Write a protein that binds this ligand. Structure first.
Ligand SMILES: [Zn+2]
Ligand SMILES: [Zn+2]
Lengths: 183, 183
């Protein structure tokens, strides 16, 4: 089918050692694999969306401001893509098949035009990568499922701080959502 | 603020011993709590939705069709509410604040008029109980979260066939989704 890759929240704040909300080693462990995956999609001409948590500094209306320290703030280094993913994007950010999409909830669909863009391009298969397996990847997958997309989870290109949550999520994807979980 | 209770998939097939997709004992273990909860909501005059999985097992177009045994099939006693929840419902089903709502995906919102009904009644706080904690309850909570509802999870009135999934889910509701997890 026509494919798209959604590369979720692979920012400094979620992966870097002093990430404002860092997932730590597991997050950095997938750097090479997710950079390779994303590059492969971009070079093969498939649709690639960098879906990135985006926060204003002064926003007492955002639900997450009740739960979390400031993170992925617009204009700060924390929001920048982590490691070798940041130059990849920089290299390709003008490409037609590359979309940088700011999002304000865990799911890449929520309050965005992701579905609009995907339908325009008649995309039927959504590949998911990024952080966290059992939060943003999960919610995105739930929306994708309910919206009728075929789903592929790249299990070596996703990670979470919580190993048990990561495991739980991969099993949920295979057994409940009926996604393909790919190595 | 205005409250509603969503009582999710508490049916024979998900709770009884011979149930087609039973969670077994944990699901039976919550019967007293979930019946007490639901009755308290009904008698207090709050909105109560019995959200019940309703499948045509004859639909190869349904994502679950080939990948789950027939469950909560219309007309079958497997679809009947479990234990004392069934006479409670039968006693109050006429009531203006009681709604029986069939659903075709895990989330109680997906393809239903749940949100319509909640808006009409100006519901601001959504209470969730039922089965399974990490499947239908989870998907329902993801949707409720993205749709901006305050969420209360009734810990002793939810259960899963998977203990690790159950614990993971309650921590997810409290920590990521910002729900109140009530004991
Ligand atoms: Zn955030
Ligand atoms: Zn079902």
């Amino acid at each position: 089918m026509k494919k798209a890759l959604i590369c979720i929240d692979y920012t400094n704040d979620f992966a870097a050692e002093n990430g404002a909300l860092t997932c730590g080693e597991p997050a950095r462990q997938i750097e090479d694999t997710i950079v390779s995956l994303t590059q492969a999609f971009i070079e093969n001409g498939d649709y690639v969306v960098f879906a990135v948590d985006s926060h204003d500094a002064d926003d007492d209306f955002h639900p997450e401001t009740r739960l979390f320290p400031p993170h992925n703030i617009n204009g700060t280094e924390g929001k920048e893509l982590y490691g070798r993913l940041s130059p990849l994007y920089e290299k390709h950010k003008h490409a037609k098949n590359v979309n940088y999409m700011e999002k304000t909830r865990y799911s890449a669909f929520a309050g965005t035009d992701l579905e609009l863009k995907l339908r325009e391009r008649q995309i039927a298969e959504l590949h998911l990568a990024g952080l966290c397996t059992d939060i943003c990847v999960l919610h995105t997958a739930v929306d994708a499922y309910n919206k009728g997309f075929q789903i592929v989870i790249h299990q070596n290109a996703v990670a979470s701080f919580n190993p048990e949550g990561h495991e739980w999520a991969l099993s949920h994807f295979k057994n409940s959502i009926g996604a393909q979980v790919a190595e």
